[PDB]
Design a binder for this molecule. Structure first.
Ligand SMILES: [Cl-]
Ligand SMILES: [Cl-]
Ligand SMILES: [Cl-]
Ligand SMILES: [Cl-]
Lengths: 106, 108
């Protein structure tokens, strides 16, 4: 498994503000078939290569796809503090996972 | 005021020496055409993505800065001297300028 996934790391944003969760896979030519964005174990949205973005109903109002394979979380609350993952499904390499840790300051 | 556009950022970053970070901004809620984004430290120019001419990284950075993702940058090999304010300045028409701020803190 040759590729590496880079993320935005440890980031803070203000309550009621927004945040771009971003990841970038590199060092591989495998096709990214889909990307899942997760708040801990809780799916936020998927971005499938053929069918584009699909958002969890529970987050539909406060999520905007992108930029790119990134995701934008809106109307942050203190409960949005924690870890987020970007799961890349690739062929043939398989799964690459990234982590981002967000602090929502009050 | 009553200016329509909004800039979202990848947030205020805490990182360690030697590390790598993605800086990125996004402009929403406006029809204006974006012709160019300037990325610049506290007042020094890091990079420019022009919509005709493409990317151009400042010479004193080409080694540590890479274009993307999107209209963002990937900044490599952090020193403590990279601590400070970073700006994504959007140049649009007709609205003119829209500006995003990212504070980068680089720890021991
Ligand atoms: Cl898939
Ligand atoms: Cl899945
Ligand atoms: Cl579809
Ligand atoms: Cl992008």
């Amino acid at each position: 498994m040759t590729g590496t996934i880079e993320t935005t790391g440890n980031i803070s944003a203000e309550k009621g503000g927004s945040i771009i969760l971003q990841c970038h896979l590199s060092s591989t030519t495998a096709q990214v078939t889909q990307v899942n964005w997760e708040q801990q174990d809780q799916l936020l949205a998927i971005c499938n290569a053929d069918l584009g973005w699909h958002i969890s109903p529970s987050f539909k109002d406060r999520v905007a796809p992108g930029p790119g394979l990134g995701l934008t979380l809106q109307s942050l609350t203190v409960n949005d503090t924690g870890e987020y993952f970007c799961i890349y499904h690739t062929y043939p390499d398989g799964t690459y996972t990234g982590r981002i840790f967000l602090e929502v300051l009050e």
